[PDB]
Design a protein around this ligand. Structure first.
Ligand code: NDP
Ligand code: ZN
Lengths: 146, 86, 295, 95, 125, 206, 134, 114
């Protein structure tokens, strides 16, 4: 039911600040020329990027390639993950390795610091399915959410 | 001008990546301790020929094939990159 | 940009170019090409006309349904001008007459009317204004046509400083009064320009933000001696080789104005008279070494 | 229920009206915006509520086979009236 | 008398399709998903080929949805994905193939609704 | 039963018997014979057999199918040989109809049947025009229904309903011109098929 | 501001919490002058003199395969191994747990409805939020 | 992989037909320009003929080549017998079609299509 958000508050035109400091519509040519001008004048640590929660992989690698071409490596996300130890070197560090379907094979589930009902409703529905049909045992560490 | 990132691609089961799998199992931890702030992105994918990607400054890249390499050749290819500065 | 004028489509008949253009003088020689090109890409065209609606019929097929709108207007009525321009983003003035009449002299058609359109357009907030002047426009010309063009060119610039002013040479084309004029004949150097080139330049001037505030000179690629041109026309027409003012203009050497941008500065490549002469003069044949160009 | 906008254009019963900067209103210059002024939402609201002595009533819109498919309306709630989904007539269980 | 031809079957030059609508299109080969609003499965038997969706815009006069895409409505039906792939290849379209999703066999037991000591016991009928 | 079409067993048996008769006489070419529940007989043949089979049915004393009612094609893209060529024939002597079917693809010529029926001339021109099936040894094979210079074969299932080009009069060039198609209102595709099976008798094996 | 495309308006690759790569399809095109997000960056790179080496969706997807081969294996779950090596590197540096209890950001259904920019803009979700808080 | 031929049994035979068709088209252009009173030059007409042939230079299937020649002969017949009108001949030149941009940036500015 959130799709109706796609019809509201949409960004439909490029905007740049005017002399009064206000965002104003402009052409693609003009908006990108301003961005390219600044990009050419900076290097390394002076350029950074932050990716939000809905960004796709094609955009993620395009932006990484562009910043790398000015020798920047400050490609950041908003969601933290500890980089201590192996960090993101090993995929198994940051994945749901058992898979979603694998929950139906588990005999004990330990939930830590999560409310899967609202963080991953369909994942939580798969836990309930195993709880109902496989007699799965679920333990939780954190607030006693329903 | 030097190195920025290493990526190692391999298959989880194909024999051609057996030498790479041994290297990771036995050498990656030691290599990681020596280069603590260097990204060494290991990415396993089924039925890919193993490869070693090196990314240098300003987005220049080089790839060396590790197919049917022994764990020693993998070490050598790793050293050839950890001292190169393309 | 208002949401209704964001471009959409693939630039064809049913597309939305985003242009809302009021074209004064749309029912003449140059108007029919300007409207056609606008309607080709899906522009909204407002056509104010003084003539009978029967005389605007050739403009109807040039736009998708709803894209050509016709309004009555009078050059001397500023309210009729206001009605026609108050919704447009560009106003194109092609009003002219190659002769004077009892009701409209060269001063009315090339000074008062263009200035009134420019003023009303400025008041109504129209962002782009395109005014066609003449290459040979000159206060000290022997032709009162070319004298009025100079005065009008001055007034339009003063009244609408951001107006794009375009100064063509004599334009050749199917419905011209240049090649057809010579073919109907029973020192001076000319640099005539093709109608489609002039039209393409006008359309590009609308799409080019640099065109604002500039004066262009639209001329052909080659200069000819008038005698050699008429000789060429007669040969192409397979023919054995009017007013006082018209004759003055035809005998006025085309000016050389390197300090102005031209068709090339708008992306249009000038078309040689040799490639289009037969297109115009074929109808004159009763059922060819080209003119010598000034180097 | 025709109302006009600041620009003067009549507002249709679907709420349509061109906004101030919309070029498309040039189509009405010298002509007119066709607007039906018998707003059905205002007309049905003028119909009185029908009092009935049963929990369930049927509506066919009037005229037998000239009306709409016959539907049965439950009138058990006393907070609101029963409204026909086809024709908008309202019903209420008396007492 | 027959001849021998080893060339990959390619008919792009004799179909009359404009070059733009061969090279730049992406055919999608797939079995349509069951419409979740209904339980019938009869619309999930065959393979379909559709093309990438392109721009639709509002007609200035009426607000109708206009298009410049001549393949916007083209949907082809195939008995097998091999037939669909073969058709796409000979027509020069690049394609994506999505493996058919088949509902897995479920284990159903009405008696489980009344289990003596399992969570499957239902509180209402 | 007032609403149900009555069966005709006698005609079903007669047509079945004749279908075997044809298959026995031309085994070289006949691949399948079937009689529909509304009593229409279809002979499915190898494409090499177009001329021998059609000649036999026209000339044999127990056939005498002297009239070519119709000749057409069906495009079935899922088939290796996408085009099905259908001949509908009429025998006045025996007051009967028969349908002969064969197949071809986009690159394999079919033998023109003009020698057997002069009626075939234009039907084969139309099949070439609308489907692009080439007929070998046709006296004059060329487009018949489409515009001159028209590109493509419209009746193919992968040809779009509205085509690729559209025409208008352009005043600048003073002639009718062809340009890529743009529609003010796109044709609205409807998904009509019910997700529920309608005819059990035709269910395919899983 | 560079207007990009939402997930309903592009064919883009997302990887779920299992590491499974999936791709959206274009349902409608982006509104107004908005553009496909990778194309904006590709266009920006050309204007800035550092043109990226891919011009199409398939070419930028070939680039994704160079960086991480699993990113183009659509619908497949590529297993990850070496939990033992990761656990070794996890120990060699020691951090201390804070005394704060683990509290999830969403304790009740009211927190569920608006978490990103699309749902924050949805009037339907606002109605849901109002319904459960009132 | 054994198939019924159309006219040609192999590429060498097929390419003979192609050359014969090209000669017929090459010699027909001057008559076409005069007969249809075209405003293009004989060189333009022949440059267009070459361009139409050249775009099919990668075909290696003799059956496809035969169909292209067959269709090319039909098009030539329509022209010589003046079944085409002037509009049909001039459709090869796309005079009223605006220049479609090719580079990435130009396409990016105008729309979403690749
Ligand atoms: N053609 C040429 O060789 C050149 C032309 N120009 C300029 O380009 C413009 C158009 O040229 P062209 O198109 O050949 O001119 P035309 O005479 O062919 O068309 C003239 C237009 O002006 C309108 N018009 C004339 N007088 C009046 C009036 N008193 N009140 C209202 N409308 C009027 C006419 O409308 P109606 O038909 O109703 O009279 C017609 O639409 C003119 O300004 C001309 O001077 C400049 C250089 C060269
Ligand atoms: Zn009712």
């Amino acid at each position: 039911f959130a799709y109706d958000g796609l019809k509201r508050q949409r960004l439909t035109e490029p905007m740049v600040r005017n002399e009064k400091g206000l965002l104003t519509h402009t052409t693609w040519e003009d908006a990108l020329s301003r961005v390219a001008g600044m990009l050419q004048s900076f290097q390394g640590n002076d350029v950074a990027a932050i990716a939000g929660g809905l960004v796709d992989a094609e955009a993620l690698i395009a932006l990484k390639d562009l910043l790398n071409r000015v020798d920047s490596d400050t490609l950041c996300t908003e969601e933290v993950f500890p980089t201590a130890g192996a960090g993101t070197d090993l995929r198994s560090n940051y994945l749901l390795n058992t898979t979603i379907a694998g929950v139906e094979e588990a005999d004990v589930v330990l939930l830590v610091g999560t409310n899967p009902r609202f963080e991953a409703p369909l994942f939580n529905a798969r836990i309930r399915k195993s709880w109902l049909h496989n007699d799965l045992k679920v333990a939780l560490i954190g607030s006693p959410v329903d | 001008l030097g190195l920025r990132e290493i990526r190692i691609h391999l298959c989880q089961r194909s024999p051609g990546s057996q030498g790479v799998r041994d290297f990771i199992e036995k050498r990656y931890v030691e290599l990681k301790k020596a280069n603590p702030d260097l990204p060494i992105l290991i990415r396993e994918c089924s039925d890919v020929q193993p490869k070693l990607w090196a990314r240098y400054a300003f987005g220049q890249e080089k790839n060396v094939s590790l197919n049917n390499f022994s764990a020693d050749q993998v070490t050598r290819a790793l050293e050839n990159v950890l001292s190169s500065k393309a | 940009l208002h949401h209704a004028v964001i471009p959409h489509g693939k630039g064809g008949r049913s597309s939305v170019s985003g242009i809302v253009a009021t074209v004064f003088g749309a029912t003449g020689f140059l108007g029919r090409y300007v409207v056609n090109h606008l309607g080709r890409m899906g522009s909204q065209v407002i056509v104010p006309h003084r003539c009978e609606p029967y005389d605007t019929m050739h403009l109807r097929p040039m736009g998708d349904l709803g894209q050509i709108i016709f309004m009555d207007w009078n050059g001397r009525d500023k309210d009729s001008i206001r009605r026609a321009v108050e919704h447009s983003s560009v106003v194109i003035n092609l009003v002219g007459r190659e002769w004077e009449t009892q009701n409209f002299d060269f001063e009315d058609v090339f000074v008062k009317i263009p200035q009134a359109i420019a003023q009303v357009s400025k008041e109504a907030g129209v962002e782009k204004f395109i005014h066609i002047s003449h290459l040979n426009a000159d206060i000290k010309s022997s032709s009162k046509y070319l004298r009025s063009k100079a005065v009008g060119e001055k007034e339009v610039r003063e009244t609408f400083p951001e107006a794009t002013i375009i100064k063509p040479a004599e334009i050749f084309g199917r419905e011209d009064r240049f090649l057809n004029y010579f073919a109907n004949i029973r020192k001076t150097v000319k640099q005539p320009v093709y109608i489609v080139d002039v039209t393409k330049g006008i359309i590009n001037a609308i799409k080019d933000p640099d065109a604002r505030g500039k004066t262009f000179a639209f001329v052909g690629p080659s200069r000819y001696l008038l005698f050699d041109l008429v000789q060429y026309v007669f040969a192409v027409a397979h023919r054995p080789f009017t007013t006082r003012d018209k004759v003055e203009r035809i005998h006025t050497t085309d000016k050389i104005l390197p300090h102005l941008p031209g068709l090339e500065d708008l992306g249009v490549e000038a078309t040689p008279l040799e490639l289009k002469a037969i297109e115009v003069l074929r109808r004159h044949r009763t059922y060819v070494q080209p003119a010598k160009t000034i180097p | 229920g025709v109302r006009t906008s600041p620009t003067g254009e009549k507002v249709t019963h679907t709420g349509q009206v061109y906004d101030d900067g919309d070029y498309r209103k040039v189509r009405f210059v010298g002509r007119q915006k066709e607007v039906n002024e018998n707003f059905a939402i205002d007309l049905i609201a003028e119909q009185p509520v029908s009092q009935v002595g049963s929990r369930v009533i049927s509506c066919d819109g009037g005229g037998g086979a000239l009306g709409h498919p016959r539907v049965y309306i439950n009138l058990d709630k006393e907070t609101k009236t029963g409204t026909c989904g086809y024709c908008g007539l309202q019903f209420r269980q008396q007492h | 008398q027959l001849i021998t031809v080893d060339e990959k079957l390619d008919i792009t030059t004799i179909t009359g399709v404009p070059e733009e609508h061969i090279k730049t299109r992406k055919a999608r080969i797939f079995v349509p998903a069951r419409n979740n609003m209904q339980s019938g499965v009869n619309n999930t038997k065959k393979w379909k080929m559709e093309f990438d969706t392109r721009e639709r815009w509002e007609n200035p006069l009426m607000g109708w949805a206009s298009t410049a895409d001549p393949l916007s409505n083209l949907v082809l039906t195939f008995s097998t994905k091999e037939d669909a792939v073969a058709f796409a290849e000979k027509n020069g379209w690049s394609y994506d193939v999505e493996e058919r999703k088949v509902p897995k066999p479920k284990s159903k037991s009405y008696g489980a609704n009344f289990s003596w000591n399992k969570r499957t016991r239902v509180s209402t009928k | 039963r007032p609403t149900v079409r009555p069966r005709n067993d006698v005609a079903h048996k007669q047509l079945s018997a004749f279908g075997e008769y044809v298959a026995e006489i031309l085994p070289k070419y006949v691949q399948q014979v079937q009689v529909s529940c509304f009593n229409e007989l279809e002979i499915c043949i190898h494409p090499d057999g177009v001329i021998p089979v059609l000649t036999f049915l026209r000339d044999h004393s127990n056939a005498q199918f002297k009239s070519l009612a119709d000749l057409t094609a069906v495009d079935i893209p899922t088939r290796q040989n996408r085009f099905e060529i259908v001949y509908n024939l009429l025998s006045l002597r025996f007051n009967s109809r028969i349908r002969v079917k064969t197949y071809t693809d986009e690159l394999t010529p079919i033998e023109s049947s003009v020698p057997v029926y002069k009626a075939a001339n234009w039907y084969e021109r139309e099949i070439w025009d609308m489907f692009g099936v080439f007929f070998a040894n046709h006296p004059d094979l060329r487009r018949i229904l489409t515009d001159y210079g028209f590109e493509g074969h419209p009746f193919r299932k992968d040809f779009p309903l509205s085509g690729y080009v559209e025409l208008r009069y352009d005043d600048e060039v003073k002639r009718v011109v062809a340009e890529p198609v743009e529609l003010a209102q796109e044709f609205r595709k409807f998904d009509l098929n019910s997700p529920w099976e309608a005819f059990p008798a035709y269910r395919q094996p899983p | 501001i560079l207007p990009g495309a939402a997930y309903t308006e592009k064919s883009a690759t997302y990887v779920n919490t299992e590491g499974r790569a999936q791709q959206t399809k274009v349902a409608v095109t982006p509104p107004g002058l908005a553009r496909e997000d990778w194309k904006i960056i590709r266009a920006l790179s050309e204007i800035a003199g550092m043109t990226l080496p891919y011009d199409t969706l398939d070419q930028v997807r070939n680039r994704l395969e160079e960086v991480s081969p699993n990113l183009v294996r659509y619908d497949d779950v590529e297993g990850a191994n070496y939990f033992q090596q990761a656990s070794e590197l996890s120990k060699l540096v020691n951090q201390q747990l804070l005394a704060d209890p683990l509290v999830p950001p969403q304790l009740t259904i009211k927190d569920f409805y608006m978490t990103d920019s699309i749902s924050r803009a949805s009037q339907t979700m606002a109605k849901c939020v109002k319904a459960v808080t009132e | 992989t054994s198939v019924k031929p159309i006219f040609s049994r192999d590429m060498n035979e097929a390419k003979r037909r192609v050359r014969e068709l090209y000669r017929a088209w090459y010699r027909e252009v001057p008559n076409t320009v005069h007969l249809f009173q075209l405003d293009i030059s004989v060189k333009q007409g022949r440059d267009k003929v070459r361009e139409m042939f050249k775009k099919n230079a990668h075909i290696t299937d003799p059956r496809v080549v035969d169909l292209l020649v067959i269709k090319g002969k039909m098009e030539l017949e329509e022209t010589i017998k003046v079944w085409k009108q002037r509009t049909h001949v001039m459709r090869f030149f796309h005079e009223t079609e605006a220049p479609r941009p090719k580079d990435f940036l130009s396409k990016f500015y105008v729309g979403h299509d690749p």
